[PDB]
Design a protein around this ligand. Structure first.
Ligand SMILES: NC(=O)C1=CN([C@@H]2O[C@H](COP(=O)(O)OP(=O)(O)OC[C@H]3O[C@@H](n4cnc5c(N)ncnc54)[C@H](OP(=O)(O)O)[C@@H]3O)[C@@H](O)[C@H]2O)C=CC1
Length: 411
């Protein structure tokens, strides 16, 4: 191995090695992949932005989008070169990315008051932040002369077989990766560059299965882990689960939401909730997995008429963030989610997307593994589940702005 795991401050060696690696990897690229790279160096912004929200449209809108072809080829290009050993990378990020919607400091100021520091630390302490899309990173710590866009510097360790594309831009070398994981900030320290103070954050990666728009693959994973689930259930448990899916969900979830088990107990309904809950514990989720849910306004105390529901006006986004960002919401009812991220008719009008990170071994079941329910790619989560809303983002779907809530199931 002619390479360390981290070049640290050795800019000269990092560049010499990366320039060599760029020439080596270029030999494994197609005409189509090369072209995709050329489009990137021509307009990083557009491609990057597209790579972040691509999977939320209708399957057909994704397939026919002019940029989709570019995305796929550039993505293939990156996967072509999987590193044989771990490596650390560096890149500047905006504090808002981690729900810190205030400035750490200004360019004018050189120091960062302890007040800000501790506030950032408490904000991005122990939370999982999902990262998506293409990103340019550096193989050495930004020093003098280097571009320093923000006061927040991230130091990330990329696992062994992570895709990485080193390439020569104009005269210098750059590195391209595609984020497809969640980040964790293990530690932050104050450092000084060119006489100015910056925050360096030590980050770690946490992997999760996220099928995004590839529902076929998701369904395959679901069938393989839950095709025999029904056989593990007692006759009474299967009966209640079938009852639920067949239409019983209405009475049951209304009973739960109106808090009937304490305000108007119904033994026959309590029995069903119990059996379904037990059914969801027979085969806990086999690994970290991301699921999606398009929520109606009522789930967040709103109505299709509420003025706060119009996210086209930023004041309303700021209001929504102030109320929910960093908070935890509880669902008394069982919550159905999809392993797929794509939009579906009947959900076209919903403007809130709940992107949930479910920990390995959490209760839950892929209901769509039961014949007769193919088309929903449904993962049902247990009633009373709690979700911590880490970060709130937005994107435009046509003329309507929608929100994506990066959340994590906690229990
Ligand atoms: N939602 C999804 O993304 C997915 C839906 N499905 C399937 O779609 C079909 C129906 O879906 P959908 O209508 O979303 O189902 P839900 O049964 O979850 O929604 C019923 C309605 O009740 C409201 N509601 C749900 N949970 C709460 C809560 N905790 N607090 C207050 N109100 C709540 C919503 O109000 P609202 O309209 O008024 O504001 C929603 O319109 C089912 O067969 C389901 O299995 C499958 C996978 C995913």
């Amino acid at each position: 191995i002619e390479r360390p795991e981290d070049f640290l401050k050795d800019k000269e060696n990092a560049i010499q090695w990366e320039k060599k690696e760029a020439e080596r990897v270029e030999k494994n690229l197609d005409t189509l992949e090369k072209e995709a790279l050329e489009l990137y160096k021509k307009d990083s912004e557009q491609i990057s932005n597209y790579s972040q929200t691509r999977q939320y449209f209708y399957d057909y809108q994704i397939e026919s989008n002019p940029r989709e072809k570019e995305y796929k080829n550039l993505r293939n290009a990156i996967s072509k070169n999987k590193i044989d050993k771990p490596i650390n990378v560096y890149y500047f990020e905006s504090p808002e990315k981690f729900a810190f919607n205030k400035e750490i400091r200004t360019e004018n100021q050189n120091e960062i008051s302890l007040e800000k520091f501790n506030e950032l630390k408490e904000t991005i302490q122990d939370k999982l932040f999902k990262q998506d899309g293409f990103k340019d990173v550096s193989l050495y710590e930004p020093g003098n002369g280097d571009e320093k866009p923000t006061p927040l510097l991230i130091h990330l360790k990329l696992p062994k077989n992570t895709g990485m594309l080193p390439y020569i831009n104009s005269n210098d070398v750059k590195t391209l990766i595609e984020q497809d994981y969640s980040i964790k900030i293990d530690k932050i320290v104050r450092i000084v560059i060119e006489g100015k103070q910056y925050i360096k954050a030590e980050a770690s990666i946490v992997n999760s299965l996220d099928f995004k728009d590839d529902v076929s693959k998701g369904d395959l994973w679901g069938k393989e882990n839950y095709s025999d689930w029904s056989n593990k259930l007692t006759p009474n448990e299967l009966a209640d689960v079938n009852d639920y899916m067949r239409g019983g969900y209405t009475a049951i979830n209304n009973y739960l939401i109106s808090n009937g088990p304490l305000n108007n107990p119904n033994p026959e309904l309590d029995s069903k909730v119990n059996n379904i809950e037990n059914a969801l514990k027979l085969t806990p989720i086999p690994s970290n997995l991301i699921v999606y849910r398009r929520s109606g306004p009522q789930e967040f105390g709103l109505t299709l008429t509420s003025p706060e529901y119009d996210f086209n006006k930023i004041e309303n986004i700021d209001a929504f963030k102030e109320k929910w960002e960093g908070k935890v919401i509880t669902y008394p009812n069982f919550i159905s989610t999809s392993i797929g991220s794509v939009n579906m008719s009947a959900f076209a009008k919903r403007k809130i997307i709940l992107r949930i990170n479910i920990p390995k071994d959490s209760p839950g079941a892929y209901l769509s593994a039961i014949p007769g329910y193919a088309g929903e790619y449904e993962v049902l989560l247990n009633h009373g589940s709690k979700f911590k809303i880490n970060k709130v983002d937005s994107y435009k779907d046509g003329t309507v702005t929608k929100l994506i809530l990066d959340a994590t199931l906690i229990n």
